[PDB]
Amino acid sequence: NDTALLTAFKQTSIKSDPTNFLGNWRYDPCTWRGVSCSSDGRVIGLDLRNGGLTGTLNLNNLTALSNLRSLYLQGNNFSSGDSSSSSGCSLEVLDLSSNSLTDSSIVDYVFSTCLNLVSVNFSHNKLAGKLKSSPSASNKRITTVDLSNNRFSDEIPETFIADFPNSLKHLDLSGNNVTGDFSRLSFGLCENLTVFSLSQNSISGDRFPVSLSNCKLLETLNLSRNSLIGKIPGDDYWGNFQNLRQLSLAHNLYSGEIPPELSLLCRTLEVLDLSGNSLTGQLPQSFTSCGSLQSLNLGNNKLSGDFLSTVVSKLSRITNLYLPFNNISGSVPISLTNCSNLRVLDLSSNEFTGEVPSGFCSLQSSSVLEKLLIANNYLSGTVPVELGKCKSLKTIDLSFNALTGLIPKEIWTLPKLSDLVMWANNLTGGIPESICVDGGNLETLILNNNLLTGSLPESISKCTNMLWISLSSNLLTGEIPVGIGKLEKLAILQLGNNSLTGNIPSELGNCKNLIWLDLNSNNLTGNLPGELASQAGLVMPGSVSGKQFAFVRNEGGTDCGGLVEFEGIRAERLEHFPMVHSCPKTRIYSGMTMYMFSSNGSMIYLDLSYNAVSGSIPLGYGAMGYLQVLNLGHNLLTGTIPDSFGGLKAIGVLDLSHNDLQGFLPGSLGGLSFLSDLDVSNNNLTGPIPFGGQLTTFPLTRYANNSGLCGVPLPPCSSG
Amino acid sequence: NDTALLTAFKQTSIKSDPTNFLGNWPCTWRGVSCSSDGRVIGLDLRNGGLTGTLNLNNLTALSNLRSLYLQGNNFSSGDSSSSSGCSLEVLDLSSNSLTDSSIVDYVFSTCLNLVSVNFSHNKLAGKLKSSPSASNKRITTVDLSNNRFSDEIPETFIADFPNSLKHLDLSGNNVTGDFSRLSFGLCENLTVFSLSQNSISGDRFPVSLSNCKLLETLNLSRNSLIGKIPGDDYWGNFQNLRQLSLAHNLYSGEIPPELSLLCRTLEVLDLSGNSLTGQLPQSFTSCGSLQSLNLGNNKLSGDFLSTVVSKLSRITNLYLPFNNISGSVPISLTNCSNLRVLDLSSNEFTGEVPSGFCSLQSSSVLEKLLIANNYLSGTVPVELGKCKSLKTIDLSFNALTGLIPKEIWTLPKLSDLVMWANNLTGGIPESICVDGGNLETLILNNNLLTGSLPESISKCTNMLWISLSSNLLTGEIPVGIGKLEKLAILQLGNNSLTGNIPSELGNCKNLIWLDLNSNNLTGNLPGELASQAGLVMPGSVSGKQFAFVRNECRGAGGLVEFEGIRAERLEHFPMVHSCPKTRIYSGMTMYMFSSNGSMIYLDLSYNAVSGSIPLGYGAMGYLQVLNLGHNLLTGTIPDSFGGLKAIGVLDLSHNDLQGFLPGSLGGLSFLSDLDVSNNNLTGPIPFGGQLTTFPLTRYANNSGLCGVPLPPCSS
């Protein structure tokens, strides 16, 4: 009886239904939520997708439904708990993706039974172990199989693919941990295969399997992020794939030149990713016949020459072009403007000389160019004013060049501008007062390590979308505009190493998402505003997440960097940055910006050092639970160290040196288990150094020049 | 009687014998040689300077003649008198003036034992027709190069040669036709073939060419072959090929990677002068025997110098000028330890001069560093002083600065110091050519050099060409210049030189080009400048690339050394813009006389020279430019100027010259640019030549000139 089976599913499996999705399941079964029936009154499809259901799934309880042909359980928190009751199965579509299944015997069962299965999606689970079983030889209908993003591991069986039914069209094995020699894997007849991906595994080999050439109908072949080695197959090999639209051999270990015979795909090829290998030479001239190519990604290779002009410019339909991290010298080719559909151009980290490309914007058509990225090159001159004509621009990155001169107002007035990134040049001038009023409401304004002068506009408050402001190591003066507190998406504010005066505006406490505040090495006076901690426990993560960054940790003392946006820049260029190459010891962390809290966070990085701030430390500062760096050194702070600082559980760096702090070191600091860099020297501190935690573990230099501190590592208090 | 034939040859054929090559004229006769029998077997009259009319029959009548050597003379073609058989095995009629190709048809029909024949460097005209007779089974060498053959070649021409042929040279003619039409036949024993420097067209090789399995040299240069270089398996047919030249054709596309199939044996490759793009394929790392690689005048780019060429262990000569190679000169190029000649001129190179070749674990063999018309910066590195084998350094048209290290001036074998169009500073050391090499060219014009020209220049007795114009030189011209008897060109314009024009310049036996304009010189015009007139001998300054910019304005433009520089780079130099109207002639230096010449170019304008014009100046018969303008010259214009037969430019303006214009100026047929304005000249304008058609500005500012184009003298 169907009513009974479904009741048995809700009680054994469902452990929590916080949305009451299954409140309708009471007593015909056909009116129940997610349940659909034939006219006979028999269940033929259960759909409980994205239902907030937590439970332990044993498919055998649901498969007992003799007429169940569709089962949708994707987007819940179903764990695994199979019993292998061989209840029999007539499923034709099954989607269990995005759960917490771990026992891969469910796949064995579904492939053994379920001889009418047409599409199965097991992706985005935690299915572990080896792949062993393929759909039963009696299954003659299966077309799509998605096993991607699980924990499959070890070697793929030599005949795993070939054993699949002839009707197979889609097979996705990406995002696992399977290994093996790719040349040993058989695709069998490969009659219907159109989509195949082994991306993001650990698959090796210097040869493709002969069998792969049998897949005459292949349309997307994705073998990226493995360890394939040798040279890319050439000769007549790519003639076997007359329908291929998307190919990726990216992020393997390929070397040599790009075979000219790869152009045999150019009748159909729409997407090509050969990035992240060790390819040398150029894109061969034969690729001029790639009339349908829309996305060409060749970044992170050793390519060189003039192929951007002699080849790429002759590709009419190209929209996305990435050649960063290569060895391409000369000046940016002008013919690149013959590409009238180019939206994204990434030429960062090459050896380009000359001036910035201006031609794209002054073509017979309104320019479609949205992203221009030419960081870490040798471009010189000034930011061309013609860029104003690229009304579609959303992102400009000219960082780490030798650009000079003012920033034309035609940049600040680009309507769609969002990211203005140009740090590590020699740009002069100031920030116009019409920012984000006549130009785009920016998300990022990153102009650190330039020669900018004047005051930060009070119209910076109009940039409500702002996520990241960096103006460090410029020559800005004036006061921090109190209007910064109107920026509620703002997460990172770096103004260190300028000559800013006035107070630290208390309005910075209204910056709801501020997690990184750096005002070091300015001329700020007044008191530490208590409002800087007012968002503690309320901060939400935001869109600053997911950006390339580097962090240079200086290791030369309190007298001897920091966070930088690092899209398209080689780490070598940072080591050789005159500022970085100075301090003897340097460790470069790098990655993508990521939050450590999903909600209810606090500030993460607070550096107010080398100013003239006076007064006492607001007790509220000690409640920033996610704060990792707190540098208040080299100021004129007075009073005591708040006992509330014992609540800085995440703190790693705590610098209070070179102030006029008095009293005792709070014993609750002994409970800071991650504190690895403390400095309280050059104060008026006295009394016992707390015994617990890491406080006894620091070099003597970090307690020096106080008014009678005692206890290890200093001489004992009982002897004085 | 053989003696009777040789005598009938001397008197009937020979018309001049200034060396008395035939004095004793039989086996005792010069060139005549016989067997023990006494039968003529070989007549050798090479390099004899004989003038005559040759009819090979008068010599083939010699029944036993097996060798004939008449190369290096001046024989013309003669009527086909008589008809005898031919027993020749070696025939050499090269470097003569033969015009009738019947001599080839006869040799190909009658000389059936002929092994090697050379008709090269003659004037043989008409179409190629006959191939060596099929009865000839021994002809191994046939050289018909450097003649005047024309029209299409017979399809069967090459294939109709017998099968023992090993060397055929058809180069240096004017033959046309699609290359695919030519049949090579079985091509069993052919090892060297050249069709170079003709007008062959087509986009396919003839299929029969693949039959030449034993080919060691294939030279197809300087034609109109079009398309892409054959790839695939084609070059596998030539497992012995040592030298290949497809240069100066119309090939386009990339260099086939499959051309690397020759790398087991290939020693010489010349693909220059086409429209090739990309780079040398990586597959070429297998070319362990490649000695000479020439890819100049293409459109190549990339780091293949580093990824490929640096891995070629046996290179000695590397030419990549006139390409699109950007970035710094790769340091890995020093891995090429046998590199003798390096030419990277006219690319897009940045960074510093490549000097690493001299710090190898062995003394470098580098003889020629040529990297002109690039964007190099910094200073001439001192590390170049360690390349003790350097003979030629060409760093012109870069952005170099600073002083020229003393280690350069002491390079013992140095001969050509060519670094013009930089911002180099300092001076010429007083120790030039004493501890360093005795130079042939010192070309440093358009720099910022200071000081004086050291008297030590007199030690550079090999000097052919000195250029220091547009510098900041001061002091006097050293009288020691007169010791340079091979000096042909001396350019010192646009400096601040003071003093006299040294009369010792008249001892420069070979001086033909002297430019001292726009200096601060005083004194008199030394008459000795014309003392070599009628005696000048041509010399080794011949055969050098040059450009001449004609301005239509001071010495702006003028003559420059132009090895490895693009004309565009001259058009955009302010050495063009100074005068608004400009035009660029270019070529190779060449004398218009073989002996008994005079000076060719003499510009002394914009100085303060006083006195009268030496009458002797009018006897310079090959002088094409005489500019004495803007000085303080007095006296009259010598009537001897009617002897300046070759003059094109005569500028005598802005002086204080008095008197009449010589009527003999009207006899100067090539005088197209005259200026006599701003003097005290008077009287009629000579009625001859082009003098009545010059603009009024060329006679203005004078004291009573009359006659067309001025108002008539009688009114």
Ligand SMILES: *[C@@H]1O[C@H](CO)[C@@H](O[C@@H]2O[C@H](CO)[C@@H](O[C@@H]3O[C@H](CO[C@H]4O[C@H](CO[C@H]5O[C@H](CO)[C@@H](O)[C@H](O)[C@@H]5O[C@H]5O[C@H](CO)[C@@H](O)[C@H](O)[C@@H]5O)[C@@H](O)[C@H](O[C@H]5O[C@H](CO)[C@@H](O)[C@H](O)[C@@H]5O[C@H]5O[C@H](CO)[C@@H](O)[C@H](O)[C@@H]5O)[C@@H]4O)[C@@H](O)[C@H](O[C@H]4O[C@H](CO)[C@@H](O)[C@H](O)[C@@H]4O[C@H]4O[C@H](CO)[C@@H](O)[C@H](O)[C@@H]4O[C@H]4O[C@H](CO)[C@@H](O)[C@H](O)[C@@H]4O)[C@@H]3O)[C@H](O)[C@H]2NC(C)=O)[C@H](O)[C@H]1NC(C)=O
């Ligand atoms: C193939 O075949 C062919 C034929 O066809 C060939 O070719 C050849 O080659 C050769 C080589 O060797 C050469 O010869 C040489 O040369 C040089 C120069 O060169 C340059 O030039 C030239 C000329 O040009 C002209 O012409 C033409 C035509 O004809 C044209 O095109 C051009 O444009 C020009 O024209 C111009 O001019 C003229 C005159 O004036 C006029 O007319 C007109 O109008 C105009 O203006 C040329 O040709 C050349 O070319 C080359 O190079 C190029 C670049 O590189 C290329 O592209 C090409 O292709 C060619 O190549 C070749 O070479 C190269 C190298 O360079 C190589 O790599 C390759 O492979 C090839 O080979 C040029 O551009 C001259 O210099 C020389 O002379 C020398 O030698 C002689 C003998 O023979 C003598 O007599 C003289 O004197 C000299 O000597 C020297 O050296 C020696 C040793 O070696 C010694 O002993 C002496 O002493 C001397 O020394 C020096 O140094 C020293 C120190 O050590 C001192 O002390 C002294 O003083 C001196 O300085 C020769 O002649 C020819 O030319 C050719 N031809 C043709 C046609 O091309 C080939 O080879 C074949 N191939 C194969 C592979 O086999």
Ligand SMILES: *[C@@H]1O[C@H](CO)[C@@H](O[C@@H]2O[C@H](CO)[C@@H](O[C@@H]3O[C@H](CO[C@H]4O[C@H](CO[C@H]5O[C@H](CO)[C@@H](O)[C@H](O)[C@@H]5O[C@H]5O[C@H](CO)[C@@H](O)[C@H](O)[C@@H]5O)[C@@H](O)[C@H](O)[C@@H]4O)[C@@H](O)[C@H](O[C@H]4O[C@H](CO)[C@@H](O)[C@H](O)[C@@H]4O[C@H]4O[C@H](CO)[C@@H](O)[C@H](O)[C@@H]4O[C@H]4O[C@H](CO)[C@@H](O)[C@H](O)[C@@H]4O)[C@@H]3O)[C@H](O)[C@H]2NC(C)=O)[C@H](O)[C@H]1NC(C)=O
């Ligand atoms: C072959 O098959 C493979 C899979 O096997 C497939 O590859 C996938 O391609 C995806 C793109 O098509 C890609 O997903 C996007 O990735 C973007 C960033 O990509 C870079 O970084 C990732 C991550 O790099 C990590 O991890 C990799 C591997 O794990 C590692 O190799 C790296 O070194 C690096 O590791 C480091 O960081 C890790 C993470 O912290 C850390 O764990 C490590 O320790 C280490 O430190 C790489 O994969 C890439 O190579 C790149 O380098 C990302 O930006 C993007 O997000 C956007 O899209 C998502 C959904 O599409 C949205 O959720 C998200 O919000 C973003 O949305 C933006 O764009 C959409 C439009 O698409 C727009 O609607 C949004 O509004 C937003 O717009 C933005 O711009 C507009 C202005 O235009 C603004 O207004 C907005 O505010 C926004 O700024 C994607 O998530 C995926 O990573 C990649 N997977 C792998 C494994 O490579 C490949 O495509 C197949 N190939 C073919 C040819 O078919």
Ligand SMILES: *[C@@H]1O[C@H](CO[C@H]2O[C@H](CO)[C@@H](O)[C@H](O)[C@@H]2O)[C@@H](O[C@@H]2O[C@H](CO)[C@@H](O)[C@H](O)[C@H]2NC(C)=O)[C@H](O)[C@H]1NC(C)=O
């Ligand atoms: C901003 O602050 C800078 C930095 O000076 C800091 O140290 C000096 C001690 O020399 C101290 O007087 C000042 O309050 C800061 O803490 C000032 O520049 C400094 O000016 C002093 C004047 O006595 C000079 O001695 C210093 O050499 C000089 N620079 C440095 C690096 O020490 C600057 O004048 C201050 N004001 C403004 C508007 O920028």
Ligand SMILES: CC(C)[C@H](C)[C@@H](O)[C@H](O)[C@@H](C)[C@H]1CC[C@@H]2[C@@H]3CC(=O)[C@H]4C[C@H](O)CC[C@]4(C)[C@H]3CC[C@]12C
């Ligand atoms: C903007 C935000 C999202 C950033 C980019 C976030 O992703 C990063 O993870 C930020 C939070 C961290 C990157 C590493 C950097 C340093 C690296 C280092 O030297 C450590 C020394 C010692 O051990 C104490 C802890 C230190 C200071 C940590 C503190 C956290 C960091 C700033």
Ligand SMILES: CC(C)[C@H](C)[C@@H](O)[C@H](O)[C@@H](C)[C@H]1CC[C@@H]2[C@@H]3CC(=O)[C@H]4C[C@H](O)CC[C@]4(C)[C@H]3CC[C@]12C
């Ligand atoms: C060093 C020597 C061997 C040189 C390089 C030799 O080769 C060249 O041929 C020299 C002699 C001649 C090249 C052309 C040049 C110019 C070209 C020109 O514009 C002419 C204008 C007028 O119509 C008549 C005279 C002019 C000035 C002639 C005079 C002869 C030249 C200098």
Ligand SMILES: *[C@@H]1O[C@H](CO)[C@@H](O[C@@H]2O[C@H](CO)[C@@H](O)[C@H](O)[C@H]2NC(C)=O)[C@H](O)[C@H]1NC(C)=O
């Ligand atoms: C199997 O289901 C998964 C999960 O629903 C699909 O992956 C999702 O694809 C959509 C396409 O719009 C993305 O928006 C989601 O982010 C993906 N889920 C992730 C990344 O967890 C997958 O496409 C399905 N299989 C097939 C073959 O389509």
Ligand SMILES: *[C@@H]1O[C@H](CO)[C@@H](O[C@@H]2O[C@H](CO)[C@@H](O)[C@H](O)[C@H]2NC(C)=O)[C@H](O)[C@H]1NC(C)=O
């Ligand atoms: C600002 O300009 C200076 C001067 O151009 C840059 O520093 C010089 O960079 C060149 C080229 O790399 C080096 O040759 C010099 O040695 C550098 N130092 C000097 C001239 O003192 C500097 O990098 C530029 N700054 C930024 C951030 O790009």
Ligand SMILES: *[C@@H]1O[C@H](CO)[C@@H](O[C@@H]2O[C@H](CO)[C@@H](O)[C@H](O)[C@H]2NC(C)=O)[C@H](O)[C@H]1NC(C)=O
């Ligand atoms: C965690 O944060 C949430 C919001 O992100 C807090 O819940 C509410 O927050 C709003 C302000 O956004 C307050 O007005 C409400 O009173 C809060 N609701 C409550 C407490 O039920 C929540 O307080 C935070 N929890 C902490 C800091 O422990």
Ligand SMILES: *[C@@H]1O[C@H](CO)[C@@H](O[C@@H]2O[C@H](CO)[C@@H](O)[C@H](O)[C@H]2NC(C)=O)[C@H](O)[C@H]1NC(C)=O
């Ligand atoms: C080749 O020898 C023949 C035969 O002696 C020469 O022909 C005679 O030349 C003389 C002198 O010009 C004439 O008078 C005769 O009429 C020619 N014919 C005879 C003798 O039959 C011929 O001149 C010789 N060739 C050369 C180049 O000297």
Ligand SMILES: *[C@@H]1O[C@H](CO)[C@@H](O[C@@H]2O[C@H](CO)[C@@H](O)[C@H](O)[C@H]2NC(C)=O)[C@H](O)[C@H]1NC(C)=O
């Ligand atoms: C080479 O021989 C030819 C004749 O074969 C000579 O040419 C003639 O030379 C005279 C001067 O002696 C001129 O008057 C004639 O006009 C020339 N004739 C032709 C047809 O050019 C030439 O002089 C000889 N050259 C030498 C011996 O160097």
Ligand SMILES: *[C@@H]1O[C@H](CO)[C@@H](O[C@@H]2O[C@H](CO)[C@@H](O)[C@H](O)[C@H]2NC(C)=O)[C@H](O)[C@H]1NC(C)=O
């Ligand atoms: C001497 O140096 C100057 C300055 O570098 C050169 O002239 C400059 O060249 C640069 C690079 O092409 C141009 O951007 C400048 O506009 C030029 N003119 C200046 C700075 O006034 C000059 O060419 C050098 N000398 C020679 C002979 O080439």
Ligand SMILES: *[C@@H]1O[C@H](CO)[C@@H](O[C@@H]2O[C@H](CO)[C@@H](O)[C@H](O)[C@H]2NC(C)=O)[C@H](O)[C@H]1NC(C)=O
């Ligand atoms: C052509 O030049 C030659 C060689 O210079 C001159 O003839 C000889 O000149 C030398 C001196 O170099 C004298 O010793 C000889 O006596 C001269 N021989 C003669 C004149 O036969 C010759 O005078 C010059 N011819 C001219 C200028 O017409």
Ligand SMILES: *[C@@H]1O[C@H](CO)[C@@H](O[C@@H]2O[C@H](CO)[C@@H](O)[C@H](O)[C@H]2NC(C)=O)[C@H](O)[C@H]1NC(C)=O
């Ligand atoms: C002589 O040399 C000068 C100096 O180079 C050339 O022209 C000058 O070029 C410099 C470039 O630094 C300028 O400062 C001067 O204004 C230029 N013009 C003049 C008239 O001095 C000059 O062209 C050279 N002479 C000729 C005839 O070309």
Ligand SMILES: *[C@@H]1O[C@H](CO)[C@@H](O)[C@H](O)[C@H]1NC(C)=O
């Ligand atoms: C698709 O699958 C069917 C059934 O297995 C097979 O016969 C056919 O050849 C395959 N290909 C196409 C293009 O239909």
Ligand SMILES: *[C@@H]1O[C@H](CO)[C@@H](O)[C@H](O)[C@H]1NC(C)=O
């Ligand atoms: C020419 O080639 C043929 C065939 O290889 C051979 O018999 C003959 O000896 C060759 N002749 C010479 C002179 O090498």
Ligand SMILES: *[C@@H]1O[C@H](CO)[C@@H](O)[C@H](O)[C@H]1NC(C)=O
């Ligand atoms: C130059 O020679 C050294 C020594 O053999 C070698 O290791 C290096 O890779 C060579 N460089 C190149 C670019 O081949």
